[PDB]
Amino acid sequence: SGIALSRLAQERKAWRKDHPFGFVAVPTKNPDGTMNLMNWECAIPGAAGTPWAGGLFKLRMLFKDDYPSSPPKCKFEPPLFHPNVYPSGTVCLSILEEDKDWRPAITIKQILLGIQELLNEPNIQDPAQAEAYTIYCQNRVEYEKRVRAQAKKFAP
Numbered sequence: 200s201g202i203a204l205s206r207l208a209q210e211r212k213a214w215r216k217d218h219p220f221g222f223v224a225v226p227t228k229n230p231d232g233t234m235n236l237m238n239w240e241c242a243i244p245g246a247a248g249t250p251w252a253g254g255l256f257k258l259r260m261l262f263k264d265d266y267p268s269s270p271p272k273c274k275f276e277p278p279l280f281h282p283n284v285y286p287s288g289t290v291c292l293s294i295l296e297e298d299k300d301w302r303p304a305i306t307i308k309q310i311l312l313g314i315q316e317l318l319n320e321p322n323i324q325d326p327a328q329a330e331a332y333t334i335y336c337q338n339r340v341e342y343e344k345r346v347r348a349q350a351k352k353f354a355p
């Protein structure tokens with residue numbers, strides 16, 4: 200898709216020029232070695248001063264041919280413990296749904312900052328996985344203990 204590839208080239212240019220510290224966002228490669236702008240490997244650092252601090256959380260960003268009509272699918276690999284992350288790793292976030300709060304103008308930087316914000320502030324109205332949601336509601340101290348252990352597990 201010329202439209203998608205043009206925009207994704209723009210996003211790549213913008214990202215490389217200016218991005219939040221500690222974040223990674225890089226296109227992958229096709230089997231013939233050429234750049235695949237439709238599939239990006241990303242990393243989100245835990246925010247300092249939070250239970251997520253010290254962790255670096257890898258995710259994949261997958262674009263459809265009609266991007267930016269549609270949002271990318273954003274998938275933590277491996278899946279994370281968090282009330283709004285499905286067991287598959289897919290992130291549940293309103294800006295990542297075409298029929299909700301997605302806008303074509305939203306940038307890869309805004310997506311990754313939006314997901315970082317989600318990590319530290321779950322949306323209890325949108326549970327995506329039973330376990331983390333249940334613990335978040337029943338015992339916040341236990342919830343943070345689990346989050347800190349996970350952050351240590353994914354320390355770079």
Ligand SMILES: O=S1(=O)Nc2ccccc2-c2ccccc21
Pocket residue numbers: 223239240241242257258259276
């Ligand atoms: O090469 S990866 O360890 N491997 C990897 C696999 C899926 C998604 C992201 C990543 C990633 C992201 C940032 C830095 C490094 C990696």
